[PDB]
Design a protein around this ligand. Structure first.
Ligand SMILES: CC(C)(C)[C@H](NC(=O)C(F)(F)F)C(=O)N1C[C@H]2[C@@H]([C@H]1C(=O)N[C@H](C=N)C[C@@H]1CCNC1=O)C2(C)C
Ligand SMILES: CC(C)(C)[C@H](NC(=O)C(F)(F)F)C(=O)N1C[C@H]2[C@@H]([C@H]1C(=O)N[C@H](C=N)C[C@@H]1CCNC1=O)C2(C)C
Lengths: 295, 290
């Protein structure tokens, strides 16, 4: 199954941030609360916000931060790209071991969807090649974060800012730099074409072979370039030599060469599933990474 | 629309490692009792009279808990320990019905590893992902700071699905906690959940499967029972009320759409990006998330 990381380490960091009439979520790490800078926007500012002008007019007591039933005193603030950083009185005693990381397309992570600073649900996500995520976010979800947890270290990789017209979602890393060409501005924007994440599909096929189903395999191989000419006709992401190297370990474990598995995928795309499933799924899964399958 | 699990933090603070002899699995530490599958001691009455407190090694992180008593309740072993869990949440033990969903905190060696969302199938299995040291992992729902524990994991059936007990040690389904040939019965699609998921689809603007027709229970059930769909009881219709009143599609209007989806298939089309009919969202799940 697709699994999220246990969310408790992140739950203890979620707070509520209110400026004026606007309330969203913030991430409380040590003595800093991180949140999307459009918390300082009103209704009139969403189209063409001048954030430096909006922020200079704010003072520390304009920001109401609430950790459960406790108000936290904001003692300073600064903006870093598209995130606001609120310095507060008190270091979060529940701060886990953490780092900020910026991820690449194809990477997976867990999202803790929060409202009013309280956790609502957790799910697993992937960064798509058009730099959106297929999330589940409602009004007030901004400042919900995405994360991985490898060996008790929480790596924060995503903070939620906006929903695009196709229902997909855009946001920043925790330094406030957007993934993709989007802007925290209510102006006309749209995601580019969302390709299937080929390297993930291939890792998932290798996962299927390891678990014992081999029905989709065939006797052919292919060149890298021939694979990409076919796969791009199905809106699959071109496969690079680095992707081939990445799948190396799985190819070593199963004894199936990477370009051999590529020929199997070409045939799957041509034939469909014929009413079968591969790992309980009747579609080709592309939000499971080569690193995920080994773990 | 995603499959969403409950935030797991309240449960993570209850997970411990239990070792008896060469066998290690997970335990649930609430107040001063650790709950775990009785097969950690591997005839269970005779195996347990021969066990003493010192046979049980309970580890909560870097701390060992001293067992000061033990007893069995059905298929769960209850180890009384010296110290109450300071992280014990508000909680209750509940037994869920087929079709109901819950979150699973998959654990190994007492340490939480992943969280996912499951449904109790009508053959009383769950389609989880559990590996060799996962026993004692639990399933749960949260309602406004109260954790309802409903599942503890015991075993994997040959078809790759899973069987366990409630927290009072009563199995779900016709299974026994011993290593012998057992198999899941014929499963079935959870009709009220599929209907819930179609309502979630129309809420999201996926409306191509709607049509002008309505059906009847017996008409629908007659078509359902040939496609192995769980008979749509009159009860099920009640629960979809808020969805039916919200969208404008009466349940039997939607059942007409579901009925025709079982015949014509979907024609390469998707509903919420799925080529199959999803049945692991309850009506309440859809209201919660939407
Ligand atoms: C949905 C929409 C029309 C509103 C708008 N989108 C675009 O302007 C775009 F289409 F350009 F992206 C949009 O999201 N916002 C407009 C305004 C902020 C953002 C916003 O409301 N963020 C929400 C934070 N709580 C999360 C949203 C709520 C619905 N579901 C979500 O995830 C900002 C870009 C500054
Ligand atoms: C998988 C298998 C051949 C082993 C066996 N199954 C059947 O005997 C059945 F098919 F009859 F169910 C089985 O599960 N067990 C054998 C023995 C316990 C249980 C068991 O090892 N439980 C594991 C707990 N840590 C979780 C398992 C590990 C693999 N994936 C899981 O979920 C018990 C019934 C007492």
């Amino acid at each position: 199954r697709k699994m999220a990381f246990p969310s408790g380490k992140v739950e203890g960091c979620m707070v509520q941030v209110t400026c004026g009439t606007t309330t969203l979520n913030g991430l409380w790490l040590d003595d800093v609360v991180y949140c999307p800078r459009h918390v300082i926007c009103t209704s009139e500012d969403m189209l063409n916000p001048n954030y430096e002008d909006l922020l200079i007019r704010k003072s520390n007591h304009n920001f109401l931060v609430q950790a459960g039933n406790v108000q936290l005193r904001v003692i300073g603030h600064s903006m870093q790209n598209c995130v606001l950083k609120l310095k507060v009185d008190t270091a979060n005693p529940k701060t886990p071991k953490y780092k900020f990381v910026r991820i690449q397309p194809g990477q997976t992570f867990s999202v803790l969807a929060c409202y009013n600073g309280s956790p609502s649900g957790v799910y697993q996500c992937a960064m798509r090649h058009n730099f959106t995520i297929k999330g589940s976010f409602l009004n007030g979800s901004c400042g919900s974060v995405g994360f991985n947890i490898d060996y008790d270290c929480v790596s924060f990789c995503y903070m939620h800012h906006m929903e695009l017209p196709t229902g997909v979602h855009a946001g920043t890393d925790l330094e406030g730099n957007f993934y993709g060409p989007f802007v925290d501005r209510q102006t006309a924007q749209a995601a580019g074409t969302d390709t299937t994440i080929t390297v993930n599909v291939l890792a998932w096929l290798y996962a299927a072979v390891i678990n014992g189903d081999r029905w989709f395999l065939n006797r052919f191989t292919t060149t890298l370039n021939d694979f990409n000419l076919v796969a791009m006709k199905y809106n699959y992401e071109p496969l690079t030599q680095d992707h081939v190297d990445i799948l190396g370990p799985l190819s070593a474990q199963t004894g199936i060469a990477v370009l051999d598995m590529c020929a199997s995928l070409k045939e799957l795309l041509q034939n469909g599933m014929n009413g079968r499933t591969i790992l309980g799924s009747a579609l080709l899964e592309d939000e499971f990474t080569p690193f995920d399958v080994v773990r």
